[PDB]
Ligand binder design. Structure first.
Ligand SMILES: NC(=O)c1ccc[n+]([C@@H]2O[C@H](COP(=O)([O-])OP(=O)(O)OC[C@H]3O[C@@H](n4cnc5c(N)ncnc54)[C@H](OP(=O)(O)O)[C@@H]3O)[C@@H](O)[C@H]2O)c1
Length: 342
């Protein structure tokens, strides 16, 4: 019963792999290069961990070799690989295609090589496949676990963000379509996880680099912004802590009540200024080294944008989510401590 995790070098995946190893699972991670496999193996230093090389999830039958090799021992699959970095003017080839093709590739590989062996697939979708991007600030829209981003292929590429959100939406659509079309052929049950913007520390301190992964780069850029930088105080989106996201993925293949569930991971609205306020509150001795405190935010005026109804998700998961102030605090502390400032 090993666990296969797609895209094991990224921000969220490294936490997922940490939780899996905490629970004594045997783990096979997918990474682009031997280069990245070598560094990861030294970071975890755990004999239960191995990596296979998948250079490009969009390519033909990308995951077939893994299942030809380990098909008999893999019992659970976490499909977390999807493009988050991409050329702003290659939205199809860098973003939508690998999102969709990586998902078809993973599911077809299971059907071809382990149809009666793989028991559960937990797929990292996104809050982006549930929400409507241009209605994040609309309090009359309520989102729940059965809501879908209505983006179409025609209007998907309005800008880089709608494109990414469409990439997650189209990929998830294909996953459920595959599941409904192959109920009797393949044995695995699918669970999708839908994080909103994921904040929290990098799994390893050494991965605190000059530029972080996209979601935490939001925090990192605000933390290093000149004191006079204009900070938006208007509602931006929902957040979730990476450690809750990692925990949720692992539960996702363990708990039978999470079968066929879309899990909506949000724990609070925020603006950029709400993040900046944590800097000033929690590290007052650094006041002036980053933009100032301002309590006049949408959030502090009762303004949180579209309504999040994830009561079903919270009941199913049963563990309590990490609050915003702590998530931001831990992100910031790890950066400042790495820099020798606190
Ligand atoms: N706010 C968030 O962070 C957030 C929210 C909702 C959902 N998600 C989803 O969580 C998952 C991980 O996101 P993240 O924040 O951890 O960003 P990340 O650090 O950039 O991780 C992305 C992972 O997927 C790999 N990947 C992307 N495209 C690939 C491709 N075409 N072929 C092979 N590997 C590919 C990446 O490897 P390389 O770096 O080597 O290319 C990396 O390991 C993604 O599916 C993302 O859509 C993230």
């Amino acid at each position: 019963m090993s666990v296969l995790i797609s895209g094991a070098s990224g921000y969220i995946a490294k936490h997922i792999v940490r939780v899996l190893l905490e629970q004594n699972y045997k783990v096979i991670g997918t990474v682009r290069s031997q280069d990245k496999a070598d560094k990861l193996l030294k970071q975890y230093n755990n004999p239960n961990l191995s990596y296979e090389i998948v250079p490009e999830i969009a390519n033909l039958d990308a995951f077939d070799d893994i299942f030809k090799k380990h098909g008999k021992e893999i019992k659970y699959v976490i499909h977390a690989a999807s493009p988050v970095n991409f050329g702003a003017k290659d939205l199809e080839k860098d973003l939508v295609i690998p999102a969709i093709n990586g998902t078809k590739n993973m599911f077809e590989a299971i059907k071809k090589y382990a149809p009666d062996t793989v028991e559960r697939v937990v797929m990292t979708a996104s809050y982006a496949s549930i929400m409507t991007p241009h209605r994040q600030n609309d309090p009359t829209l309520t989102l729940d676990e059965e809501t879908w981003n209505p983006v179409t292929e025609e209007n998907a590429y309005e800008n880089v963000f709608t494109a990414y959100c469409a990439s997650k939406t189209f990929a998830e659509k294909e996953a459920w379509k595959f599941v409904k079309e192959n109920s009797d052929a393949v044995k695995f049950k699918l669970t999708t996880i839908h994080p909103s913007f994921v904040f929290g520390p990098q799994n390893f301190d050494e991965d605190v680099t000059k530029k972080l992964n996209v979601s935490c780069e939001i925090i990192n850029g605000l933390l290093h912004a000149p004191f006079d930088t204009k900070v938006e105080k208007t509602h931006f989106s929902q957040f979730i802590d990476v450690r809750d996201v990692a925990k949720t993925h692992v539960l996702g293949f363990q708990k039978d009540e999470l079968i066929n569930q879309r899990l909506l991971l949000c724990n609070g609205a925020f603006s950029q200024q709400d993040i900046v306020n944590v800097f000033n509150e929690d590290f007052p001795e650094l006041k002036g080294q980053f933009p100032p405190e301002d309590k006049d935010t949408d959030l502090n005026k009762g303004v949180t944008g579209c309504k999040i109804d994830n009561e079903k998700t919270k009941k199913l998961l049963a563990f309590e989510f990490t609050p915003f102030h702590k998530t931001i605090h831990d992100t910031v502390y790890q950066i400042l401590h790495k820099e020798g400032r606190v």
